[PDB]
Write a protein that binds this ligand. Structure first.
Ligand code: FDA
Ligand code: GRG
Ligand code: GRG
Length: 452
């Protein structure tokens, strides 16, 4: 078959892959990005399409404009299980036309010298001499089966992780996903009968009975259009997620016109700390494939862009040293951990605590204001549950006369703080990975026991 040589092969053109291509462009490298979807459909994986504005500023990413920006978001309304307590959390964000924005990032990267093949699937990894050295591609637009060699492969294949899973199991980069460390999520976009009240605000509903292990959402895409859906924790034996959706849709969305459905469907969402290493010999993994999703609120498009940024930085460093080993790409880990990874680890622990709380706990905690909306933001943006904040909450929880998991909040804050310092002390070299990884596992396995 035909053989081609590139500096970098990016597999997948989602928020992760496209950002990697964008950040790597016009810097002296020959880059190819492939995606199985046709161009017009790239980026249409079922999503809430809600991204914070702060993510776009930090990375120097182009703002969504025009048709790409469907609705401006100014805050979030968080509802308690009994619908009695509503927390308001302010912050600027965007409700996106995800495919339109994604395709512009790709189009601009293409204008900056990056080559993009749509309708192309990476079938087989080229793994020779202990290194990832490229892939076998199938371009069905030209019906060609091409062999592409690269110094670095960027695996950004989404939740399917369809490429790195085909690599030898001895590689740390093939770390798989535990069922309980993910949520199955489903959404629909419909037009509403009446105009949406406070359409610049997102609505998040917490209820362990209508969406166990996750939550329901009501995300306005306009004055008369809304993205409504839910997520539940996997590997718990719960029935099909569509059963939850059909049963409780009217409770959270009574205003939608069910005869005006635009899109529907669901997918898997990682809800854990990232891959213990997102880099190895000749390969970097980003996005959902590298578990870059926020463990608490399940947002992963902003962090996907972050992972793409770090992927670009690490690759450029590798070429300046002629080192494409794990050691030569190790800055990928250091960058992402500081940027988002350390937060994920802390939030991984906090998630496990939150998912085990009852509706009574959540109703009590929100009505009695154990933590402020302000001090909640700090938890979901820096991953920090300050020991002073936890103490303040524990004084309120002390007024509860019934048994509850809430009494362990201080211990949770200490565990979050512990694993945070552990990730900030991420190994400087690949030779310290195994030791560091086992220490992380010990923190988690210990924590899981403390919640019982
Ligand atoms: C229902 C639901 C709702 C939400 C969310 C998820 C889900 C399922 N998320 C999470 C967010 O959607 C997700 O984390 C990111 O889109 C992940 O971006 P990636 O590019 O890594 O994956 P993504 O799946 O977008 O990219 C994978 C791409 O790789 C391609 N590909 C796969 N295998 C391939 C192969 N072998 N060869 C070639 N191409 C291949 C696919 O075709 C696809 O284009 C979210 N996040 C957020 O920020 N806010 C929100 O509101 C939500 N809400
Ligand atoms: C539905 C699933 C699975 C995930 C959704 C993920 C979420 C909740 C995304 C919301 C992103 C968004 C549009 C946020 C805007 C509102 C907000 C509180 C943003 C906070 O971000 P910043 O803008 O940095 O906050 P500041 O106001 O402090 O600057
Ligand atoms: C997980 C379970 C069982 C329940 C609730 C999940 C919760 C509490 C979500 C809180 C929503 C929240 C406060 C989001 C913070 C605002 C936000 C999206 C900021 C920007 O996101 P980053 O990507 O972290 O930056």
């Amino acid at each position: 078959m035909k053989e081609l040589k590139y500096d970098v092969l990016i597999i997948g053109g989602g928020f992760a892959g496209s950002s990697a291509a964008y950040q790597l462009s016009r810097r002296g490298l020959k880059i190819l990005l492939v995606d199985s979807k046709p161009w017009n459909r790239i980026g249409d994986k079922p999503c809430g399409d809600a991204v914070s504005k702060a993510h776009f500023d930090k990375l120097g990413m182009p703002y969504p404009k025009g048709e790409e920006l469907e609705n401006k978001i100014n805050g979030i309304k968080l509802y308690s299980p009994d619908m009695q307590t509503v927390w308001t959390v302010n912050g600027e964000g965007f409700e996106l036309n995800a495919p339109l924005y994604n395709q512009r990032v790709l189009k601009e990267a293409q204008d900056r010298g990056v080559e993009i093949w749509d309708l192309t699937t990476a079938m087989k990894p080229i793994f020779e001499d202990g290194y990832v050295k490229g892939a076998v591609l199938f371009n069905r637009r030209t019906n060609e089966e091409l062999t592409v060699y690269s110094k670095v492969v960027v695996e950004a294949t989404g939740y399917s992780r369809s490429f790195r899973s085909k690599l030898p199991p001895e590689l740390p980069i093939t770390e798989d996903l535990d069922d309980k460390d993910a949520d199955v999520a489903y959404r629909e976009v419909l037009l509403t009968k009446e105009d949406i009240e406070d359409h610049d605000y997102l609505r998040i509903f917490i209820d362990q009975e209508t969406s166990p292990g996750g939550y329901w959402w009501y995300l306005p895409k306009g004055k008369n259009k809304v993205n409504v859906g839910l997520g539940i924790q996997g590997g718990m034996g719960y029935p099909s997620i569509h059963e939850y959706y059909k049963k409780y849709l009217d409770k959270y969305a009574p205003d939608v016109d069910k005869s005006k459905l635009l899109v529907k469907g669901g997918a898997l969402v990682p809800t854990r700390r990232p891959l213990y290493t997102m880099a190895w010999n000749g390969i970097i993994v980003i996005g959902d494939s590298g578990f870059t999703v926020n463990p608490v609120h399940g947002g992963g498009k902003g962090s996907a862009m972050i992972s793409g940024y770090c992927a670009a930085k690490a690759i450029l460093s590798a070429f300046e040293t002629g080192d494409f080993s794990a050691s030569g790409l190790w800055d990928m880990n250091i960058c992402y951990v500081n940027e988002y990874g350390a937060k994920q680890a802390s939030l991984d622990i906090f998630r496990r605590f939150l998912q085990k709380l009852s509706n009574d706990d959540i109703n009590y905690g929100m009505k009695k204001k154990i933590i402020k909306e302000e001090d909640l933001l700090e938890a979901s943006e820096k991953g920090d549950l300050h020991l002073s904040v936890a103490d303040k909450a524990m004084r309120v929880i002390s007024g509860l006369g019934r048994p509850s998991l809430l009494f362990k909040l201080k211990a949770v804050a200490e565990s979050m703080k512990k694993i945070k310092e552990l990730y900030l002390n991420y190994p400087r070299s690949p030779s310290s990975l195994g030791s560091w990884r086992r220490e992380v596992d010990n923190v988690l396995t210990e924590f899981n026991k403390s919640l019982s």
